């Protein structure tokens, strides 16, 4: 009970201080946002 | 893993002329997507190692 409660408290302190562990899910936001922002810039170029 | 490659649109399409580089910028983001796709292959080939 000293080992298990202190190990789960280090998980809660790491996710609050550092957001870099969730950055695999942040790329799922980022790869969908950069695909939409590139597709809407196709109308500005003249295509010849 | 596979062989990591990178393809430029400038030296491949154009023969180093000023007319080809002016008509390449009218097409816009066609070579923006191709350079970011071959970059994203080469990051994931190092993650396989």
Curated annotation (Swiss-Prot), chain B:
Disulfide bonds join 9-31, 14-20. Precursor of the fusion protein processed in the biosynthesis of the S protein and the formation of virus particle. Mediates fusion of the virion and cellular membranes by functioning as a class I viral fusion protein. Contains two viral fusion peptides that are unmasked after cleavage. The S2/S2' cleavage occurs during virus entry at the cell membrane by host TMPRSS2 or during endocytosis by host CSTL. This is Spike protein S2. It comes from Severe acute respiratory syndrome coronavirus 2 (2019-nCoV).
